């Protein structure tokens, strides 16, 4: 969260993987301009990803599943 990131560690577990997953999500919002699931409330992309992980919306597996979905939609469009 804002202050401390303990809760988001408790969702995923490995501090190291927490950082990778929060990084990947923050990159989506930074570059892709992906819309945040929680109200922004003037928060940086680093903190928003941690909010989304805390509440259990963002996760390595979930991100991978939606990557496949958008990627398959684009394959559909190209063919």
């Amino acid at each position: 969260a804002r202050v401390t990131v303990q809760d988001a560690v408790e969702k995923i577990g490995n501090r190291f993987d927490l950082v990778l997953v929060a990084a990947r999500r923050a990159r989506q919002m930074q570059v892709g301009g992906k819309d945040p699931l929680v109200p922004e409330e003037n928060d940086k992309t680093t903190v928003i990803a941690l909010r989304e992980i805390e509440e259990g919306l963002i996760n390595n597996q979930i991100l991978d599943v939606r990557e496949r979905q958008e990627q398959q939609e684009q394959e559909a469009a190209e063919l």
Binding site: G13, N14, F16
Partner: protein, 189 residues
């Protein structure tokens, strides 16, 4: 530098038997605090061998440790880094708790560096000889392990062993105080 947590569980039963540092009467370092946050090896129950109390690879939390003290367990084989089978690193279970986090160590943590730093720091930062008579603090019976002494014309037991360990046993039969007797000593009893 190379030592990193590579595996979660090597599934080895090996364990460094750690005893309570009881040197100089007052227990210097308790066994509870010496095995606090370390994976246990071998289903070690209570005195009465008929029902398992503790399992195998199980993180010793402050709660488990408090149970250990009611039963007064003296010796515990615990899983250690040295006896870990993992090739090219060590297992989260052989190590135990990341003392800085207060829970089981995360795989990928650079343990060796932390070890070297933590041994090195105190040294770098840190940069009464009236021991004549042993007087015993609590009543009990004299236990002399490793001792070969000769009786002198006084009536008294004059020790002639080099390694001499006087211990203070209670009633139930636990070791509670230690006292390094030297060579050339007169024992009262």
């Amino acid at each position: 530098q190379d030592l990193v947590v590579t595996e979660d569980d090597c599934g080895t039963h090996e364990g460094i038997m750690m005893t309570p540092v009881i040197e100089g009467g007052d227990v210097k370092e308790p066994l509870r605090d010496r095995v606090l946050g370390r994976v246990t090896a071998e289903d070690v129950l209570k005195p009465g061998t008929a029902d398992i109390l503790v399992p195998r690879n199980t993180l010793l939390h402050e709660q488990w440790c408090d149970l250990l003290e009611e039963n007064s367990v003296d010796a515990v084989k615990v899983r250690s880094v040295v006896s870990c089978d993992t090739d090219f690193g060590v297992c989260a279970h052989c190590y135990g708790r990341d003392l800085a986090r207060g829970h089981i160590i995360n795989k990928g943590e650079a343990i060796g560096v932390i070890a070297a730093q933590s041994i090195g720091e105190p040294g770098t930062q840190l940069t009464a000889a009236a021991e004549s008579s042993i007087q015993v603090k609590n009543k009990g019976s004299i236990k002399l392990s490793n001792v070969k002494s000769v009786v002198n014309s006084s009536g008294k037991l004059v020790i002639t062993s080099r390694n001499t360990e006087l211990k203070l046993i209670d009633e139930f039969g636990r070791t509670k105080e230690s006292y390094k007797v030297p060579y050339g000593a007169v024992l009262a009893k």
